[PDB]
């Protein structure tokens, strides 16, 4: 599939402060860049949008590019690529901002999903005007890793599905597409009510 990831992740944080290779193992880059690599090695067409080059060293960047990941710095160019748009914002600082930036540019029937735990209805309500009136084809969901992407113990992804009280923020096809994306990289998908 064509996947767009927004945010490579500050790799220094993972290495200096969090000591991920020592505590959980695996190998940098982690997070969004780690997801991009794993997706690409699974045969997916991956574009990673990152405005700040300094998020990782040249050696780590080469690692990303060696996986087949196309790296851009313009979110709008990334917006026109993916049928799935993964907002890697574990701190949820710019989640709503990126979504607002890319929503009018994403191709028909594309999916926008966050990796953090901002509720899908919240993400939807921030874009309700556009999603109801101009982009009814766009699905809103989640791609939330239980652990740190790139770590061997990261096995689960939580996907926001149809709400308990009926509201569908994405089609069943769109949700199924996310489910198979998770399994394509040997991970376990888990669909929850939005």
Swiss-Prot record:
Keywords: Oxidoreductase. The keyword Mitochondrion does not apply. It comes from the Archaea. GO terms for molecular function: oxidoreductase activity. The keyword Cytoplasm does not apply. Belongs to the HMD family. This is H(2)-forming methylenetetrahydromethanopterin dehydrogenase-related protein MJ0715. It comes from Methanocaldococcus jannaschii (strain ATCC 43067 / DSM 2661 / JAL-1 / JCM 10045 / NBRC 100440). The lineage of its organism: Archaea, Methanobacteriati, Methanobacteriota, Methanomada group, Methanococci. The chain holds residues 1 to 194 of 338 of the full protein.
């Amino acid at each position: 599939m064509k996947i767009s990831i927004y945010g490579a992740g500050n790799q220094r944080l993972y290495l200096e402060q969090l000591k991920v290779p020592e505590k959980f193992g695996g190998e940098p880059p982690y997070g969004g860049a780690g997801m991009a690599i794993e997706f690409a090695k699974a045969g997916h067409d991956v574009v990673l949008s990152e405005p700040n080059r300094d998020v990782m060293s040249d050696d780590l960047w080469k690692k990303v590019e060696d996986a087949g990941v196309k790296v851009v710095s313009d979110d709008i160019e990334a917006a026109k690529h993916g049928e799935i748009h993964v907002l890697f914002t574990p701190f949820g600082r710019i989640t709503l901002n990126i979504a607002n930036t890319i929503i009018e540019h994403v191709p028909e029937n594309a999916i926008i999903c966050n990796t953090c735990t901002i509720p899908t209805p919240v993400l939807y309500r921030s874009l309700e005007g556009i999603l109801r009136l101009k982009r009814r084809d766009v699905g809103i969901s989640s791609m939330h890793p239980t652990g740190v992407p790139g770590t061997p113990s990261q096995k689960y992804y939580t996907i926001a599905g149809k709400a308990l009280e009926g509201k569908e923020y994405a089609t069943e096809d769109q949700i199924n597409k996310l489910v198979e994306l998770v399994k394509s990289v040997g991970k376990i998908p888990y669909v929850t009510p939005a």
